[PDB]
Amino acid sequence: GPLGSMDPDTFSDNFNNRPIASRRNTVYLCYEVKTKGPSRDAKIFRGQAASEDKYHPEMRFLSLVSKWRDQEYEVTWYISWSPCTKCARDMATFLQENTHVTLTIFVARLYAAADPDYQEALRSLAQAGATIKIMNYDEFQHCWSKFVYSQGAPFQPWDGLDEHSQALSGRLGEILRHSMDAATFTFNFNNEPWVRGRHETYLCYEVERMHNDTWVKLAQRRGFLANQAKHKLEGRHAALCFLDVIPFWKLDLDQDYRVTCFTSWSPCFSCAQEMAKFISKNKHVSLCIKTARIYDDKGRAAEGLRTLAEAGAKISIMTYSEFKHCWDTFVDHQGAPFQPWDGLDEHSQDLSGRLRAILQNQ
Ligand SMILES: [Zn+2]
């Protein structure tokens, strides 16, 4: 194992998009610096380093891209975990201040845990002039063949490489676009009460401040999220993941707000109790939960919705207006209008009647 390299046991430990997470918060970055120009035979300078905080040898390339005569640089990152909340912002600053440097980042695992500032930092880094993509078979093979000391051993992938590297691609697309996919929305937000294959739960949310005598939308605070799930790397539900993102808003305690939650699946009993116990401790928030389908939760969901509404939560079923409003704001439509599926108003009124029955104690 030559110094400055990673033996195969270190590669197949950091660059592995399988569910397993990072209890040991370690990241490993491989960098390729090239002189921008016409040369297809340009000498690419490769290096690699893992996060070592004290001295930071992973940033030993920032001196390799100093402005030197009329030379531009192309940098290619093969980073293990997604960049940090502060590292991404600092790299955006550096890309803004150093115009002669272009950067292309390849991510193996995205930071599953989120924070509005983290998404903001990734989007600002993308705006700065960087290109972020998820590693697939080509990138994993190209990294194994130039940053791993393999004594002849060829690259052997895992079972679900593309199956995970495409889910992470969709996650990154949702993160960078600030809008989810149109097919994803037309799939998850369905109106029929009994469906199949809707394992994940998507949740959009809007905030409105009470100014003058009017709810004014805090348009800089709207956003969506999805559940985590999976195993072998557990995860919370979408409602609980929304109850975690609220403290990062720095809400004013003297004024009142209205928070609207557009949910694909209605909250279960655990999430309903957690939401009730949250809004009971934050009386400066009026929660209105507009849902698409009514999640039965094996029976214990009607009582959960009843308990949630007894604290002061406006539970309701999405109609055509709410579906179209969710289309024009949270999905990547690119100008296309909302074309609703057949039966929208029918299942809408049916689920409204069933919710009214549930709420009239039934
Ligand atoms: Zn739940």
Side-chain angles (χ1 to χ4, degrees), residues 1-42 44-53 55-229 231-232 234-249 251-282 284-313 315-362:
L3 298 180
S5 89
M6 60 202 215
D7 68 322
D9 285 285
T10 308
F11 169 77
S12 40
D13 191 13
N14 303 120
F15 294 95
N16 204 27
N17 52 104
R18 296 157 47 92
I20 213 174
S22 78
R23 181 106 48 200
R24 283 119 283 197
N25 278 65
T26 187
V27 314
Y28 201 120
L29 166 60
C30 303
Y31 58 89
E32 300 185 336
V33 190
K34 184 213 302 184
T35 285
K36 174 171 289 204
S39 274
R40 263 182 181 173
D41 57 355
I44 304 194
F45 293 75
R46 275 132 196 175
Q48 66 221 95
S51 176
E52 185 42 293
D53 253 28
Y55 308 90
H56 277 288
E58 57 261 38
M59 293 308 186
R60 211 170 71 253
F61 84 104
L62 291 176
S63 77
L64 254 62
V65 285
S66 290
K67 39 174 135 55
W68 180 246
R69 278 202 283 270
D70 280 10
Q71 297 178 349
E72 277 105 2
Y73 300 107
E74 308 189 80
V75 187
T76 308
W77 276 13
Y78 292 94
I79 190 177
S80 159
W81 277 90
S82 162
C84 202
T85 315
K86 140 171 167 295
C87 181
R89 202 108 48 75
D90 283 356
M91 203 60 196
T93 295
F94 171 81
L95 276 178
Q96 290 166 8
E97 298 178 344
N98 272 245
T99 320
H100 49 277
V101 159
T102 56
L103 178 59
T104 291
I105 301 189
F106 284 97
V107 183
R109 305 187 210 81
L110 271 179
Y111 263 23
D115 181 349
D117 205 342
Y118 171 81
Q119 221 147 320
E120 251 176 272
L122 275 197
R123 291 178 279 209
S124 71
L125 172 56
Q127 180 210 355
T131 69
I132 299 111
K133 299 187 254 202
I134 267 54
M135 289 177 143
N136 224 67
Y137 185 81
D138 301 326
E139 288 77 42
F140 278 118
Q141 148 76 347
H142 181 257
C143 161
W144 162 278
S145 173
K146 281 159 203 59
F147 296 100
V148 177
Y149 187 78
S150 61
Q151 303 119 354
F155 172 60
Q156 318 212 353
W158 30 99
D159 266 302
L161 189 137
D162 211 87
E163 307 183 295
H164 292 137
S165 167
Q166 268 190 45
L168 301 176
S169 313
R171 285 269 167 264
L172 184 73
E174 297 176 22
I175 284 182
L176 291 164
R177 291 184 293 233
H178 204 352
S179 58
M180 76 176 71
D181 193 80
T184 301
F185 179 82
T186 321
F187 187 27
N188 290 272
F189 287 69
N190 222 284
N191 226 12
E192 34 191 304
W194 234 253
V195 305
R196 309 186 219 258
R198 277 73 164 180
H199 305 351
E200 41 183 0
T201 296
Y202 273 77
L203 185 149
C204 320
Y205 49 81
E206 297 169 357
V207 194
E208 301 181 76
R209 193 233 290 274
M210 181 53 180
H211 215 52
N212 324 327
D213 286 312
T214 293
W215 291 115
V216 280
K217 273 206 193 69
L218 303 176
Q220 88 190 63
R221 324 271 260 201
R222 68 96 172 171
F224 70 109
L225 59 83
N227 89 323
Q228 273 143 220
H231 262 77
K232 188 263 291 275
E234 323 153 25
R236 324 151 101 250
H237 287 170
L240 286 168
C241 278
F242 174 68
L243 299 167
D244 281 25
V245 75
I246 302 192
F248 304 94
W249 277 331
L251 251 63
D252 214 314
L253 264 164
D254 299 339
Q255 322 178 259
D256 308 55
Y257 298 103
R258 197 175 72 184
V259 185
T260 325
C261 262
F262 304 96
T263 65
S264 160
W265 275 116
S266 90
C268 63
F269 190 76
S270 288
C271 293
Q273 283 208 288
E274 273 277 317
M275 285 188 147
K277 300 180 304 191
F278 169 81
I279 77 168
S280 295
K281 305 194 306 246
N282 295 255
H284 68 292
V285 158
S286 311
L287 198 79
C288 34
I289 301 190
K290 275 121 165 191
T291 188
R293 284 173 309 279
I294 295 179
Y295 187 53
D296 193 58
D297 191 11
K298 300 242 190 239
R300 324 121 61 191
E303 182 169 72
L305 299 184
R306 239 185 320 281
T307 286
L308 178 58
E310 95 161 33
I315 314 290
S316 58
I317 267 54
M318 286 184 213
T319 58
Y320 174 50
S321 43
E322 282 102 281
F323 277 134
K324 195 165 90 64
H325 172 42
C326 280
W327 173 269
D328 292 52
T329 39
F330 299 91
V331 316
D332 178 51
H333 49 88
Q334 305 181 10
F338 178 43
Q339 200 219 313
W341 43 101
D342 319 306
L344 198 84
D345 313 348
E346 185 159 311
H347 308 274
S348 166
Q349 72 196 11
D350 284 5
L351 290 176
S352 270
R354 188 183 150 186
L355 182 74
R356 284 154 19 184
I358 289 175
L359 271 283
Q360 273 134 60
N361 203 291
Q362 269 253 11

PDB file of all heavy atoms in Angstrom, residues 201 236-240 265-272 295 297, ligand 1:
ATOM      1  N   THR A 201     -43.276   8.931   0.532  1.00  0.00           N
ATOM      2  CA  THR A 201     -44.248   9.975   0.837  1.00  0.00           C
ATOM      3  C   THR A 201     -43.597  11.330   0.605  1.00  0.00           C
ATOM      4  O   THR A 201     -42.590  11.654   1.243  1.00  0.00           O
ATOM      5  CB  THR A 201     -44.751   9.864   2.280  1.00  0.00           C
ATOM      6  OG1 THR A 201     -45.460   8.630   2.449  1.00  0.00           O
ATOM      7  CG2 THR A 201     -45.680  11.021   2.610  1.00  0.00           C
ATOM      8  N   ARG A 236     -36.901   8.242   8.953  1.00  0.00           N
ATOM      9  CA  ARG A 236     -38.152   8.749   9.493  1.00  0.00           C
ATOM     10  C   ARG A 236     -39.151   9.007   8.366  1.00  0.00           C
ATOM     11  O   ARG A 236     -38.815   8.977   7.180  1.00  0.00           O
ATOM     12  CB  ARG A 236     -37.903  10.029  10.294  1.00  0.00           C
ATOM     13  CG  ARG A 236     -36.591  10.024  11.066  1.00  0.00           C
ATOM     14  CD  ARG A 236     -36.025  11.428  11.245  1.00  0.00           C
ATOM     15  NE  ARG A 236     -36.298  11.963  12.575  1.00  0.00           N
ATOM     16  CZ  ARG A 236     -37.151  12.951  12.824  1.00  0.00           C
ATOM     17  NH1 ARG A 236     -37.811  13.523  11.828  1.00  0.00           N
ATOM     18  NH2 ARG A 236     -37.339  13.372  14.067  1.00  0.00           N
ATOM     19  N   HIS A 237     -40.399   9.263   8.750  1.00  0.00           N
ATOM     20  CA  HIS A 237     -41.442   9.556   7.780  1.00  0.00           C
ATOM     21  C   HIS A 237     -41.321  10.996   7.284  1.00  0.00           C
ATOM     22  O   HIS A 237     -40.499  11.781   7.761  1.00  0.00           O
ATOM     23  CB  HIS A 237     -42.821   9.308   8.388  1.00  0.00           C
ATOM     24  CG  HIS A 237     -43.151   7.858   8.564  1.00  0.00           C
ATOM     25  ND1 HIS A 237     -44.255   7.426   9.268  1.00  0.00           N
ATOM     26  CD2 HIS A 237     -42.527   6.741   8.121  1.00  0.00           C
ATOM     27  CE1 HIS A 237     -44.295   6.106   9.253  1.00  0.00           C
ATOM     28  NE2 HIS A 237     -43.258   5.665   8.564  1.00  0.00           N
ATOM     29  N   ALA A 238     -42.160  11.342   6.305  1.00  0.00           N
ATOM     30  CA  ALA A 238     -42.103  12.682   5.730  1.00  0.00           C
ATOM     31  C   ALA A 238     -42.614  13.729   6.710  1.00  0.00           C
ATOM     32  O   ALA A 238     -42.070  14.837   6.782  1.00  0.00           O
ATOM     33  CB  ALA A 238     -42.899  12.729   4.428  1.00  0.00           C
ATOM     34  N   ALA A 239     -43.658  13.398   7.475  1.00  0.00           N
ATOM     35  CA  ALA A 239     -44.189  14.350   8.445  1.00  0.00           C
ATOM     36  C   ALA A 239     -43.174  14.644   9.542  1.00  0.00           C
ATOM     37  O   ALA A 239     -42.974  15.807   9.916  1.00  0.00           O
ATOM     38  CB  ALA A 239     -45.494  13.822   9.044  1.00  0.00           C
ATOM     39  N   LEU A 240     -42.529  13.604  10.075  1.00  0.00           N
ATOM     40  CA  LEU A 240     -41.491  13.819  11.076  1.00  0.00           C
ATOM     41  C   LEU A 240     -40.307  14.574  10.487  1.00  0.00           C
ATOM     42  O   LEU A 240     -39.685  15.396  11.171  1.00  0.00           O
ATOM     43  CB  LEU A 240     -41.043  12.482  11.664  1.00  0.00           C
ATOM     44  CG  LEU A 240     -42.031  11.829  12.632  1.00  0.00           C
ATOM     45  CD1 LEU A 240     -41.638  10.388  12.921  1.00  0.00           C
ATOM     46  CD2 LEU A 240     -42.108  12.629  13.917  1.00  0.00           C
ATOM     47  N   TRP A 265     -49.253  11.205   1.261  1.00  0.00           N
ATOM     48  CA  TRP A 265     -49.882  10.272   2.183  1.00  0.00           C
ATOM     49  C   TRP A 265     -50.284  11.009   3.452  1.00  0.00           C
ATOM     50  O   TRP A 265     -49.511  11.812   3.984  1.00  0.00           O
ATOM     51  CB  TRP A 265     -48.940   9.117   2.535  1.00  0.00           C
ATOM     52  CG  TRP A 265     -48.969   7.987   1.557  1.00  0.00           C
ATOM     53  CD1 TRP A 265     -47.940   7.559   0.770  1.00  0.00           C
ATOM     54  CD2 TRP A 265     -50.081   7.134   1.263  1.00  0.00           C
ATOM     55  NE1 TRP A 265     -48.343   6.493   0.004  1.00  0.00           N
ATOM     56  CE2 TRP A 265     -49.654   6.213   0.287  1.00  0.00           C
ATOM     57  CE3 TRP A 265     -51.398   7.061   1.730  1.00  0.00           C
ATOM     58  CZ2 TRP A 265     -50.496   5.230  -0.231  1.00  0.00           C
ATOM     59  CZ3 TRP A 265     -52.231   6.084   1.215  1.00  0.00           C
ATOM     60  CH2 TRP A 265     -51.777   5.183   0.245  1.00  0.00           C
ATOM     61  N   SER A 266     -51.495  10.736   3.931  1.00  0.00           N
ATOM     62  CA  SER A 266     -51.952  11.352   5.164  1.00  0.00           C
ATOM     63  C   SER A 266     -51.095  10.867   6.334  1.00  0.00           C
ATOM     64  O   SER A 266     -50.615   9.729   6.332  1.00  0.00           O
ATOM     65  CB  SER A 266     -53.421  11.025   5.419  1.00  0.00           C
ATOM     66  OG  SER A 266     -53.551   9.841   6.184  1.00  0.00           O
ATOM     67  N   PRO A 267     -50.879  11.713   7.340  1.00  0.00           N
ATOM     68  CA  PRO A 267     -50.009  11.322   8.457  1.00  0.00           C
ATOM     69  C   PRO A 267     -50.556  10.116   9.208  1.00  0.00           C
ATOM     70  O   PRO A 267     -51.765   9.975   9.403  1.00  0.00           O
ATOM     71  CB  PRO A 267     -49.988  12.573   9.343  1.00  0.00           C
ATOM     72  CG  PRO A 267     -50.333  13.696   8.420  1.00  0.00           C
ATOM     73  CD  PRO A 267     -51.306  13.119   7.437  1.00  0.00           C
ATOM     74  N   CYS A 268     -49.644   9.242   9.629  1.00  0.00           N
ATOM     75  CA  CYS A 268     -49.999   8.060  10.403  1.00  0.00           C
ATOM     76  C   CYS A 268     -50.237   8.465  11.857  1.00  0.00           C
ATOM     77  O   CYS A 268     -50.236   9.649  12.203  1.00  0.00           O
ATOM     78  CB  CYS A 268     -48.914   6.996  10.267  1.00  0.00           C
ATOM     79  SG  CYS A 268     -47.303   7.484  10.919  1.00  0.00           S
ATOM     80  N   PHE A 269     -50.439   7.477  12.735  1.00  0.00           N
ATOM     81  CA  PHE A 269     -50.757   7.783  14.127  1.00  0.00           C
ATOM     82  C   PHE A 269     -49.562   8.383  14.859  1.00  0.00           C
ATOM     83  O   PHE A 269     -49.712   9.365  15.596  1.00  0.00           O
ATOM     84  CB  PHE A 269     -51.250   6.529  14.848  1.00  0.00           C
ATOM     85  CG  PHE A 269     -51.815   6.800  16.216  1.00  0.00           C
ATOM     86  CD1 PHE A 269     -53.076   7.355  16.364  1.00  0.00           C
ATOM     87  CD2 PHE A 269     -51.088   6.493  17.353  1.00  0.00           C
ATOM     88  CE1 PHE A 269     -53.599   7.603  17.617  1.00  0.00           C
ATOM     89  CE2 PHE A 269     -51.607   6.737  18.611  1.00  0.00           C
ATOM     90  CZ  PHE A 269     -52.864   7.293  18.743  1.00  0.00           C
ATOM     91  N   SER A 270     -48.373   7.803  14.680  1.00  0.00           N
ATOM     92  CA  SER A 270     -47.182   8.338  15.333  1.00  0.00           C
ATOM     93  C   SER A 270     -46.905   9.765  14.878  1.00  0.00           C
ATOM     94  O   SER A 270     -46.672  10.661  15.699  1.00  0.00           O
ATOM     95  CB  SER A 270     -45.979   7.437  15.049  1.00  0.00           C
ATOM     96  OG  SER A 270     -46.069   6.215  15.762  1.00  0.00           O
ATOM     97  N   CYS A 271     -46.937   9.995  13.563  1.00  0.00           N
ATOM     98  CA  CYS A 271     -46.696  11.334  13.044  1.00  0.00           C
ATOM     99  C   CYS A 271     -47.804  12.298  13.444  1.00  0.00           C
ATOM    100  O   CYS A 271     -47.532  13.475  13.699  1.00  0.00           O
ATOM    101  CB  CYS A 271     -46.541  11.288  11.524  1.00  0.00           C
ATOM    102  SG  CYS A 271     -45.061  10.407  10.962  1.00  0.00           S
ATOM    103  N   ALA A 272     -49.050  11.823  13.525  1.00  0.00           N
ATOM    104  CA  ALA A 272     -50.135  12.695  13.965  1.00  0.00           C
ATOM    105  C   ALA A 272     -49.943  13.123  15.414  1.00  0.00           C
ATOM    106  O   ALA A 272     -50.127  14.298  15.753  1.00  0.00           O
ATOM    107  CB  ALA A 272     -51.484  11.999  13.788  1.00  0.00           C
ATOM    108  N   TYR A 295     -54.269   7.929   4.309  1.00  0.00           N
ATOM    109  CA  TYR A 295     -53.534   6.761   4.777  1.00  0.00           C
ATOM    110  C   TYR A 295     -54.295   6.130   5.939  1.00  0.00           C
ATOM    111  O   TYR A 295     -54.555   6.793   6.948  1.00  0.00           O
ATOM    112  CB  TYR A 295     -52.120   7.159   5.196  1.00  0.00           C
ATOM    113  CG  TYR A 295     -51.222   5.996   5.550  1.00  0.00           C
ATOM    114  CD1 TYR A 295     -51.057   4.932   4.675  1.00  0.00           C
ATOM    115  CD2 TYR A 295     -50.534   5.965   6.756  1.00  0.00           C
ATOM    116  CE1 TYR A 295     -50.237   3.866   4.990  1.00  0.00           C
ATOM    117  CE2 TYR A 295     -49.711   4.903   7.081  1.00  0.00           C
ATOM    118  CZ  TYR A 295     -49.567   3.856   6.194  1.00  0.00           C
ATOM    119  OH  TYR A 295     -48.749   2.797   6.513  1.00  0.00           O
ATOM    120  N   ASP A 297     -53.347   3.479   7.807  1.00  0.00           N
ATOM    121  CA  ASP A 297     -52.431   3.138   8.900  1.00  0.00           C
ATOM    122  C   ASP A 297     -52.945   1.940   9.698  1.00  0.00           C
ATOM    123  O   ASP A 297     -52.886   1.908  10.929  1.00  0.00           O
ATOM    124  CB  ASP A 297     -52.191   4.348   9.808  1.00  0.00           C
ATOM    125  CG  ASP A 297     -51.060   4.130  10.796  1.00  0.00           C
ATOM    126  OD1 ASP A 297     -50.323   3.131  10.657  1.00  0.00           O
ATOM    127  OD2 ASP A 297     -50.914   4.959  11.717  1.00  0.00           O
TER     128      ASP A 297
HETATM  129 ZN    ZN B   1     -46.008   8.736   9.390  1.00  0.00          ZN
END
